[PDB]
Amino acid sequence: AKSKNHTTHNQSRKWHRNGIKKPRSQRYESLKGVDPKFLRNMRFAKKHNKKGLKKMQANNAKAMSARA
């Protein structure tokens, strides 16, 4: 009652029945898996960007609108 053990015949055709897909769409790449010291940099940097960016960027926008 010996049977056939292992083969890869008729496998690439089944692969190309449905058109093997690149992931092909990653805009704004995922952030997990990155250095926790770098994350302790980046999250505090982002929340202080949210806090203290108003007046200097506002005056710079006024200055570049006056100069351009």
Amino acid identity at 24: R
21 or 27: whose CB is closer to another protein?
A: 21
Interface contacts to another protein, rule CB under 8 A: 6, 11, 15, 20-23, 26, 29, 33-35, 38
Amino acid identity at 29: E
Residue 66 partner contact from Mg ion, RNA, another protein, none using kind-dependent CB cut-offs of 5 to 8 Å: none
From residue 3, give the alpha-carbon distance in Å to each of 6, 7, 10, 57.
9, 12, 18, 75
CB of 68 to RNA, least distance (A): 7
